[PDB]
Design a protein around this ligand. Structure first.
Ligand code: CL
Ligand code: CL
Ligand code: CL
Ligand code: CL
Ligand code: CL
Length: 271
């Protein structure tokens, strides 16, 4: 059918020939896998700087399908997936590679922390912190409109592009909504909860959520109605917006389209 055909097309489009890519230095490494700098030879004969993230036949197929879907996203505030390559290890283990644009400014969380150091970016003014929030809201609004759930929204998974536009990427107890802690159920409103926490990371310029509270204590902390505290120098109206994201009942939380307009309005009002 059309659904099957659509997926077949996306699959064709997402794979990149291993020989159009060369891998460079490791930029980061963990239990999940690696990030390396790379070069991608493009259709026009010129090479592009890329970031390359490395991680059963079903698990490979699932990766491929998921990647196929993700490449299809087309929004300035959603990371553009350039494609994927599957290289096989010497021990016959598949090595799936995600190719992405190289972003010299890195993730938003690290950037916020650097901005509090002398060598890093200058003190980020309120208006710019808010613009970061609008951008993320715009990306999450897009995803939500196509019923895609992010499931790992946090400032560390938002990327800064060369023009300082933020995009959501990488689709963590202190980001998880109360209902997902309880019933392991996760909806678009759970992403909205994560977005509120992310807004708080931005307003605190990179603080870890819930200082003084440990991960194992989180469910009970939230259970007794405690939430993230208003950051110093955070507008009361901005705090109300982020607090709305943590309403106990998912259905009372605003949608991303509503949040986005609230945030845009607030930004407009600043001089
Ligand atoms: Cl190579
Ligand atoms: Cl991008
Ligand atoms: Cl970029
Ligand atoms: Cl901190
Ligand atoms: Cl707090």
């Amino acid at each position: 059918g059309s659904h099957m055909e659509e997926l077949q097309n996306k699959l064709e489009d997402v794979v990149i020939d291993r020989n159009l890519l060369i891998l460079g230095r490791i930029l980061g490494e963990g239990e999940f896998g690696s990030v390396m700098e790379g070069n991608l030879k493009q259709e026009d004969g010129t090479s592009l700087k890329v970031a390359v993230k490395t991680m059963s036949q079903r698990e490979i197929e699932e990766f491929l399908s998921e990647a196929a879907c993700m490449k299809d996203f087309s929004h300035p505030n959603v990371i553009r997936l350039l494609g994927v390559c599957i290289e096989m290890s010497s021990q016959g283990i598949p090595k799936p590679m995600v190719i992405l644009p190289f972003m010299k400014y890195g993730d938003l969380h690290t950037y916020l922390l650097y901005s509090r150091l002398e060598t890093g970016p200058r003190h980020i003014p309120l208006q710019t912190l808010l613009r970061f929030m609008v951008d993320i809201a715009l990306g999450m609004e897009y995803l939500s409109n196509r019923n895609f759930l992010h499931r790992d929204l946090a400032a560390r998974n938002c990327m800064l592009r060369d023009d300082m536009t933020v995009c959501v990427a990488d689709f963590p107890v202190k980001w998880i909504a109360i209902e997902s802690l309880a019933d392991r159920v996760y909806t678009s409103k759970s992403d909205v909860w994560a977005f509120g926490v992310t807004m708080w990371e931005i307003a605190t310029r990179g603080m870890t959520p819930y200082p003084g509270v440990q991960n194992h204590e989180m469910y009970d902390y939230l259970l007794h109605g405690h939430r993230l505290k208003q950051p110093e120098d955070c507008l009361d109206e901005l705090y109300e917006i982020m607090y709305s994201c943590w309403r106990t009942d998912p259905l009372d939380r605003p949608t991303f389209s509503v949040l986005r307009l609230q945030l845009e309005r607030l930004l407009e009002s600043l001089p």
